């Protein structure tokens, strides 16, 4: 069941825990996972619940030496990484090797800026009742100490503009391809018969 | 993102790249200095400025 490549998952409109559990299962099963736009992941419940939970998490530090205590990562990518870590036997070699196969990013790095991302419908936020508040990990990270919200926003805006231009060109070329098949009809009529008879169009 | 150095660098500025300047051959920036008076080096410097 292993995938040849890494699984690229768009984090937008995904429930934190559900996506984390699915990704942890995949990592344990042997795949590599890349999560993009970790700042677009959501957590159910009003913002205050998540904010106070993270504040209580921040309060957990070693009294003797905080440099030893829990390390409270503020970036959305590291937040998702730690959430997945919690779902792995990370204290063992199996869990460590599984966790080292995960990459979580804020925004879409140039390496993956030109690939198709996946979604897990079982982890989409649209399973929540419409009358249910939810927070965004980007806002939570910004309010708990993340310092690169605006930079990522600007980079994402530039990326979206470029993608929109590319999609306009692709729409034009797709219309052109439809017209090309229409023109080719006389030559391909011999084969289109077989295609349609076997049910493929 | 990038750094562009002046064509001529003072000896005391180049000393900072050394722990044994007097004992060395003092070769720091010697090849870089020649880029400024070269056709390709000038193109690279202009690209860095851009």
């Amino acid at each position: 069941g292993l995938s040849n490549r890494a699984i690229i998952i768009d984090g937008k409109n995904h429930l934190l825990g559900r996506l984390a559990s699915i990704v942890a299962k995949k990592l344990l099963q042997g795949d590599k996972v890349v999560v993009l736009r970790a700042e677009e992941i959501v957590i159910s419940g009003n913002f205050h619940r998540s904010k106070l939970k993270y504040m209580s998490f921040l309060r957990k530090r070693c009294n003797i030496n905080p440099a030893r205590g829990a390390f409270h990562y503020r970036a959305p990518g590291k937040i998702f990484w730690r959430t997945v870590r919690g779902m792995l036997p990370h204290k063992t070699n199996r869990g460590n090797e599984a966790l080292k196969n995960l990459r979580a990013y804020e925004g879409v790095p140039a390496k993956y800026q030109k690939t198709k991302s996946l979604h897990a419908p079982s982890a989409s936020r649209f399973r929540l009742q419409p009358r249910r508040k939810f927070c965004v990990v980007g806002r939570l990270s910004h309010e708990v100490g993340w310092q690169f919200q605006d930079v990522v926003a600007k980079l994402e805006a530039k990326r979206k503009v470029k993608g929109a231009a590319y999609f306009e060109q692709k729409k034009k070329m797709d219309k052109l391809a439809v017209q090309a098949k229409k023109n080719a009809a006389p030559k391909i009529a011999q084969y289109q018969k077989i295609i349609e008879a076997l049910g493929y169009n | 993102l990038t750094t562009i150095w002046a064509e001529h660098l003072s000896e005391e500025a180049r000393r900072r790249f050394y722990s044994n300047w007097a004992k060395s051959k003092k070769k720091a920036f010697t090849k870089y200095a020649k880029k400024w008076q070269d056709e390709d080096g000038k193109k690279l410097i202009e690209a860095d400025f851009a």
Binding site: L176, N183, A184, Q192, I195, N201 | -
Partner: protein
């Protein structure tokens, strides 16, 4: 925003469960979840089904509250619901998938050959168009 509604006479398509892939007519609504449907002409018995298993089609019959099997059948053949449904892309896709699932190895080979030839020709024409 909502055009198709769960109404008496609405023709529904059983998406999942017992009679998957058939059509029936709503003859009663028991509650917000359960609806009594009877597809006599589509080989569906008068039963109660969860709306979670049903999908609304565009055909509504002129039925009466709790119309009996006879009346719903008469309305079904009068409206010709099955022909019109078969005309839709909804049914065309289902028929295509049914044909697909039953392909043999030889048929798969023939399809592959014909498809690649068609793709090559269409690519030639697409290059022609792109040059202009």
């Amino acid at each position: 925003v909502f055009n198709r509604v769960v109404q008496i006479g609405r023709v529904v398509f059983i998406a999942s469960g017992k009679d998957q892939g058939k059509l029936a007519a709503i003859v009663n609504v028991i509650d917000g979840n359960r609806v009594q449907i009877d597809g006599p002409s589509s080989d569906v018995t008068r039963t109660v089904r969860n709306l979670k298993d049903l999908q609304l089609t565009k055909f509504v019959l002129k039925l009466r509250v709790g119309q009996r099997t006879k009346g719903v059948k008469a309305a079904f053949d009068a409206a010709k619901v099955t022909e019109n449904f078969q005309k839709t892309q909804w049914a065309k896709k289902i028929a295509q998938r049914a044909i697909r699932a039953k392909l043999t190895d030889f048929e798969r080979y023939k399809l592959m050959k014909a498809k690649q030839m068609r793709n090559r020709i269409v690519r030639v024409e697409l290059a022609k168009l792109k040059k202009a």
